[PDB]
Amino acid sequence: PWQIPPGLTELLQGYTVEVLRQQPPDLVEFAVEYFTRLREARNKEQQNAFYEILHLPNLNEEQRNAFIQSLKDDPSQSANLLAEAKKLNDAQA
Amino acid sequence: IPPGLTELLQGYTVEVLRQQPPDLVEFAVEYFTRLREA
């Protein structure tokens, strides 16, 4: 459509706040820097979830699959899914 | 607010609305890199 992306404000907000802290001399160069590192952090954070869930010992095969399936489909809630998979795992001990 | 920050973030914002990329962060790396190259 032509909509306003959810999270656009928060995402722009955080770049600005970090601009404050370091006062980079070139806003463009820092943006390339900020968002690259913000990307890498997310890839890093997602990779890790996948595995942990991978070998969580008290999950049956069907649960591990559901969580991993949700994880591959939606990186943004990797923290949400890792939490839910650990809660359901701890209870299943 | 440092000078230029508003115009810079506005520019990115218009293109986000123009193009509706599926990931804002990934597009950000895309958008600002092209801007740096120019």
Numbering used by the authors:
A (entry chain B): 2 to 94
B (entry chain A): 5 to 42
From the paper:
Here, we propose a method for generating proteins and protein complexes with complicated shapes using fusions of alpha helices. To design amino acid sequences that can stabilize the alpha helical structure of the fusion sites, we superimposed one or two turns of terminal alpha helices of connecting proteins using a molecular graphics program. Our method does not require complicated computer calculations for the design process and can be used for the assembly of artificial protein complexes with predictable and rigid structures.
As a control, we produced a fusion protein of PKA_RIIα and protein A by the end-to-end fusion of the connecting helices. The resulting protein was readily produced in E. coli and could be crystallized. The crystal structure shows that the PKA_RIIα-protein A (end-to-end) fusion protein shows substantial structural variation at the fusion site. Asymmetric unit of the crystal has four fusion proteins. The remaining three fusion proteins in the crystal show substantial structural variation at the fusion sites and their protein A domains could not be superimposed. The PKA_RIIα-protein A(end-to-end) fusion could be crystallized but the connecting helices in the crystal have substantial structural variation at the fusion sites. Therefore, overall structure of the fusion protein cannot be predicted with high confidence. We and others have demonstrated that the simple end-to-end ligation of helices does not create a single continuous helix, and therefore, the structures of the resulting fusion proteins cannot be predicted with high accuracy.
